[PDB]
Each structure stands twice: as C-alpha cells, then as structure tokens.
Design a protein around this ligand. Structure first.
Ligand SMILES: CC(C)(C)c1ccc(N(C(=O)c2c[nH]cn2)[C@@H](C(=O)NC2CCCCC2)c2cccnc2)cc1
Ligand SMILES: CC(C)(C)c1ccc(N(C(=O)c2c[nH]cn2)[C@@H](C(=O)NC2CCCCC2)c2cccnc2)cc1
Lengths: 299, 299
C-alpha cells in the first residue's frame, strides 16, 4: 500500500509560466487556452481587496507573458483574455501540440487525485491527495506553486479537477475546479477566512481496514456489527463523514468475508484508541486510501 | 506534515519499452542505443528453478529479442547485439532514443529515497517513492509483469537510474538490480525460496523525522543528554538500527533547530524502549521513511 500517483508526463507537457506585472505563477496550456489563477492580476498593494472585474478591464492581451520552459520551448503570444470564476482563460495563438485528451470534472470529498507541483512553470514533484471533507487538501505546496494542477486519468483521458490557488490560515491549501469555482468557496484575497472542521473519510477508513485484513492484519475484527444507519448517526457526533457504500467496497467485503458493518463497529472502537497495537504500520486511522486504491493495489 | 513526493516521471516515461524473449515479456529502459532489461526474460517458463544464464545468453540469436515502443509514435526497435552485465541484459538497438535524458548510474544506499515508475508491458501506470531498506528490499506496489520498472533520482537535469525491478520475495517485499548489474542484497534471480535478512530502522531518517517534529513544535523528547555517534552505532548493532552517518542535509536541520544530532541519538535510545505516555506528530512509533532532504525541502 503505497501512495501512488499517475505518471505525470502528459501533464508536464502542458505546464507554462504566466506573468502579469509583478506576479508570476503556473498555467495549464490546453489547445489554444492557457488557464491560470486570476490572482496573477492582483497588484502587490491590493492583496487584501482586489476588484477582479476592474482589474480585468485594465488588462489587455499585452499584460500577460506566457513561457513554456520544459520540453519543446516557447514564447506564446496571448491573443485573448477572459475570466471564469476564480480562473483566467487566456487564448494563445499556438495550439499545444501535446494536449492530452481531457475533461473537467469537480472532485468530491474523499476522492483521490494526483498533483503535479510546479514552480515558475517547471514541474518539480508529484504526489497524491484526497479532497478533504472541509474542501481543502494537504500536499506539499510552497511559494509560487499557484497554478499547479490536480488530475485523475482513466484510459487515455485526463480529468483535470484542481488548480492550486492559495494557502489557508491553518497551514492547509485550496484551489479551483476548472469551471472556475473555488473548492470550499474560499476567496482569492488576503483576508481572514475560516475553514470548517475536517472529518475522517469513513469509506476510505473502511477500505484501509479491508487492506489490513487482506494483508493478514485482522486483530480488530469482531463478530459485532453496527448498521450503516446507526454508524451514520454516530458519525455526525464524532467528525466522520457519512458512509456511502460502493461496488468497490462490496468487492472487498466479498473477497475477505468480513461485512461492512463489522468494520463500522471496529471503527467506533478504534477511534477510542488502538490500545498498544498497530494496523498496517500505523497507530491511527488512515483515510487517504480509497476503495478503488485498495482494489487496484492489492487485488 | 510530511508527504510522499516523487520526481516528475515524464523524462523516464519517454524511455520505457517492452522487451519480449520467447514467451516472456517485461519492461526495458531505452537510453541512447541501448535497452536495459532483467536477464530473466531469457528464462524458459518451465525452467525457473535454476537457470544457466551464461548458457542462455549463448543460445540467443540475432532475433531472439523483440523490443516495442508503445508511448509516443509506436515502433519496433531492431536488436543488433546482446550482452549480459550481472543480472541485467544490455541490448543494442539500431535506433537511438531521441529523448535520452542526461543520466548517471549510481547505486543507492539503505535509507536513501528514490522515485519508481511502475510499468506493465512497456506502459507506465503509476509512480511512487520508496526508501531502500537496510535488508536491501523495497516496499513497493508492484504486480505481475512489473519487472524492468525503473527507480531513479534527479539532481538538476541529470537523472540517476538506481533500480531496475527484478522480483517479489515471499513476504511481499521487492528487490531489483543497480544498473551495474548487481542485485541489491545479492538475491538470486531464480525460483528458489531465499531468506531476506531482518529489517532495521534507518537511523539517519529517524533523526530527520525527529527534526521535523521539532520544527512543528513537538520537542518534548529533547534533553541535554547526548549519545555520541560512535556510542550510538555500537548500540545500534544490538538494537535493530542502522549505523548513523551524518550528512550536510542533517547538519542544516541541526542549525535550524539548535538541537544537536547527539541529543536526538540519545532520544532514539529512549524512544526505542517506549514513547512512555506521549506521542510524536500524533504517532507512537518511529518513522524512518523520510530523509533529511525530504524534511529540508518540505519544512
Ligand atoms: C494575491 C493573493 C490572492 C492574496 C495570494 C498571495 C500569495 C499566494 N501564495 C503564492 O505563493 C503565490 C505565488 N504566486 C502568486 N501567489 C502563497 C499564499 O497563498 N499565501 C497566503 C498567506 C496568507 C493568506 C493569503 C496568501 C502560497 C504559499 C505556499 C503554497 N501555496 C500558496 C496565493 C494568493
Ligand atoms: C524468472 C524468475 C527470476 C523466477 C522470476 C519469475 C516471476 C517474476 N514475477 C513477474 O511478475 C514477472 C513478469 N515478467 C517476468 N517476471 C513475479 C515474481 O517475482 N514471482 C516470484 C514468486 C516466487 C519467487 C520467484 C519469483 C512478480 C510479481 C509481482 C511484482 N514483481 C515480480 C520475477 C522473476
């Protein structure tokens, strides 16, 4: 059970550097469009209250410089600009010759995706995250990583689901979907904002306990059961998400012979403390492995 | 708040090929005019118990090997010579990889981290990072057909290829070769049950993790007491720890925190007998999978 990411080559070929005035960050070049956070337009003196409608008017095509450093370089010419929620949509006069087949879909809490971290348009690392129940993610993002993208891949099709926007007050990160909406509705300004409480992703904890059983670690399995409806009542009071079963979870239950409701009961007990014991090299519950992850990696 | 980070894999993806010999197929690494792959692709499927690789090489002919590139513009690559180096084959092909990165071949040491590109049938499917264990295995996520998958580090634009995947051991752990051809831990590429040595804690990585704990406000384990490196290292031989070897990366953590290596070596001796009633970054067990370099670049 390792933290697995998709191979990043397809997305690396799309990363560019976008500069506007004194701001520089990353953009995603797909066909004739370069996507980037709209806060590239924010002046250094208006961090706390930018008017993005106003800033958009004051811009022309010549206000944005776009450079591709990786691979086959350029030196793109911006020939149009528009704003879409919290994103800039720049039109450039060359279609990216390495554009993958792609879609734009918003991810839901508990779902995993790969992130390609970039600085000044250069990819530097990749890792996998889950969208937290409070619509934040915990990866490794340093200064200038804005515009780094998160994505999944199915067959030949990349689903772009995240473009990094900002660090929040609790050391945590959020970003936009490519429809322009910010995950969790955070504002792209220097302003005090509160994030809701995080929660354990119940269905991923279930998947992880199934991975433990599959690896011969089942000391926590009892005959006792908690129904889904009763677990979901308990979860509201203990910062767990609502458990929603899936065909992926059912495959693990069939394979191990341990019912979902046995693991729901185990979670309730393990939340109280592991006593002196370990599960898959961990002394706490793990909720960043999805049922699909466990099925892929162990079956 | 450490995360498992891998290098972007695009450069390496462009070098992966599929190598077929008889009815056996696995992955190869295409650099300049050479394709590297595990020599057990020559082993007949009924003869896994103990092959004679010197003889198998002799019996190979002009067209015993088929190499296919699937990524990019697909192509058959004609094999024009074949050599053996340790547990790897070195196949000469008549076309040079037009996307050969600047590269070296260095053997990694236990405790060091590297990125792995997992492939099947010459097609990359995922990337993850591991540390070389003290018993010269790695805890990867590798399924059947992953042989030939490659591990590597990067410095600047130079890729250091350090691992080519060879086999899965009885305990689910994995081993492979360095590109000089030597199998890590001298494991034999035969269908023979063989014994891996007992694992150990990577001492320099536990030190790194204690430094990350101190950087995040968790320092209750720091006392004035010191254990010298030489004293720690003799203790380590009897208590399942690797020898401690300092590096410039560790030194930078010492400077940032004002805590000396020898204070943490003392602390490790105490934490090994027990955390008593406390936790370190929420955990009650020692973490040795993050390197000094990881902590320096992430915190
Ligand atoms: C203009 C605006 C909206 C206030 C803003 C300012 C800076 C950035 N940050 C850029 O690093 C960066 C680089 N280029 C442009 N911005 C960083 C960032 O969020 N600091 C926040 C700290 C206080 C709350 C507001 C901003 C950042 C660091 C590490 C990982 N992720 C992002 C993001 C948004
Ligand atoms: C010929 C030789 C040396 C005995 C051998 C045979 C099979 C493989 N394995 C290939 O999957 C595979 C695919 N193509 C060629 N080999 C698998 C493997 O190690 N089973 C071991 C089982 C008992 C001990 C011998 C090998 C494998 C599975 C998952 C992840 N990693 C490797 C590796 C080496």
């Amino acid at each position: 059970l390792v933290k697995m990411s998709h191979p990043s080559g397809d997305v690396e070929a799309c990363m560019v550097q976008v500069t506007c005035g004194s701001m520089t960050l990353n953009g995603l070049w797909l066909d004739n469009t370069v996507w980037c956070p709209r806060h590239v337009m924010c002046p250094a003196d208006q961090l706390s209250d930018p008017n993005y409608d106003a800033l958009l008017i004051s811009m022309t095509n010549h206000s944005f410089s776009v450079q591709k450093h990786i691979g086959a370089p350029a030196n793109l010419r911006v020939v149009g600009h528009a704003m879409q929620g919290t994103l800039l949509k720049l039109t450039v006069d060359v279609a990216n010759p390495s554009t993958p087949a792609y879609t734009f879909t918003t991810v839901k809490p508990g779902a995993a995706f790969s992130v390609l971290a970039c600085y000044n348009g250069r990819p530097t690392g990749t890792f996998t995250v889950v969208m937290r129940p409070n619509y934040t993610i915990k990866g490794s993002f340093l200064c200038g990583s804005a515009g780094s993208v998160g994505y999944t891949k199915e067959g030949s099709v990349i689903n772009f689901c995240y473009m990094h926007q900002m660090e929040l007050a609790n050391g945590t990160h959020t970003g936009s979907a490519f429809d322009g909406t910010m995950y969790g509705a955070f504002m792209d300004k220097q302003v005090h904002q509160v994030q809701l409480t995080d929660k354990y992703c119940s269905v991923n904890v279930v998947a992880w306990l199934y991975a433990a059983i599959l690896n011969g670690c089942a000391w926590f399995v009892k005959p006792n059961r908690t129904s889904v409806v009763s677990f979901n009542e308990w979860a509201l009071a203990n910062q767990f998400t609502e458990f929603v079963g899936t065909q992926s979870v059912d495959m693990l239950a069939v394979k191990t012979g341990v019912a979902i409701e046995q693991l729901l009961y185990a979670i309730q007990q393990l939340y109280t403390g592991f006593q002196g014991k370990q599960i898959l090299g961990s002394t706490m519950l793990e909720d960043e492995f999805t049922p699909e992850d466990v099925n892929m990696q162990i079956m």
